[model samples]
Target: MHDYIKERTIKIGKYIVETKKTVRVIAKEFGVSKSTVHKDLTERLPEINPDLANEVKEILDYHKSIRHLRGGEATKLKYKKDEILEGEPVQQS
Candidate 1:
């Protein structure tokens, strides 16, 4: 069960980070706490599959880098825009 949890946790983490979903959203979907999700990805997932975990970490780092931007954008879109919500891809020109 431990290995299964680790594997599933990594899989879900990769999906969420790649989809640009917030950690909170990921945690909620997984029925885990945010801290558990964080630890599973950063600590346990790497132990299970280093390469995949590292890749996931790269995407997660990107999210971490722009976390504040994400929050602010959510606020902006909530008030001003009706087309795109937080984490939704922007339209190309």
Candidate 2:
């Protein structure tokens, strides 16, 4: 692996381990695609440092587990905003 690529892979691994942020968030913050981040962490990182790779893997797995809940909450907020914009106060359910 080129020096820059190896460095980036390790940096990404550390960032994920430190923040425990979602892959999408990390990709956006780094101006890279989601696939690139996934590849770097899952593929490249392991070859570079297995221990750091394991830590990042755990963080990614935790995010995966809760991603559905995150999506549902975002959808809920979108609909709630739509209701307010339509001048209908959201009724307590």
Candidate 3:
């Protein structure tokens, strides 16, 4: 394997563990494709560093679990702000 690729794999793994960022976020942060980020964690990182692999594995799993809720929160906030009543709330006094 190329040395730079190996180092990228390791660095990406460390970045995820340190920041606890999600796969898409990590991919963007490290200038790699989402596929590459996912592959490195699920495939390459485990082969090279099993300990970090497991930690990252757990982190990613939790990431998956919370991601749906994250989207849910966004959707809720998007609709929640539509309670506009500029003209109707005014009363002549």
TM per candidate: 0.56, 0.66, 0.64
The candidate maximizing TM-score is 2
Q: How far in Å is the alpha carbon of 10 misplaced in model 3? A: 0.6
| Residue-wise C-alpha lDDT for candidate 1, range 1-93, written one tens digit per residue | 596677777766577657766667788887889888878777787788777677666766777777777797777666676676359666674
The window of 10 residues in a row where model 1 has the poorest summed lDDT is 84-93
Off by over 4 Å in 3: 70-93
Q: Any runs in candidate 1 off by more than 4 Å, and if so which?
A: 68-93
Name the candidate, 1 or 3, with the larger lDDT value: 3
Query: Deviation in angstroms for 40 in model 1?
Result: 1.0
Give lDDT for model 2: 0.79
lDDT of 3 by residue, 1-93 (tens): 565566677877788778877677788877889887778787778777888788677776797687777887766685778775456565575
Candidate achieving higher TM-score, 2 or 3: 2
Which 10 consecutive residues of model 2 have the lowest summed lDDT? Answer: 82-91
Candidate 1 Cα lDDT to native: 0.73
Cα RMSD (Å) per model?
Answer: 9.8, 8.4, 12.1
Angstrom error of the Cα, residue 66, model 3: value is 2.2
**lDDT, model 1, position 7:** 76
Give the alpha carbon lDDT tens digit for every residue of 1-93 in model 2.
Answer: 376778887777888767877677778988999898888788878887889889877876687688778788877788667455456566674
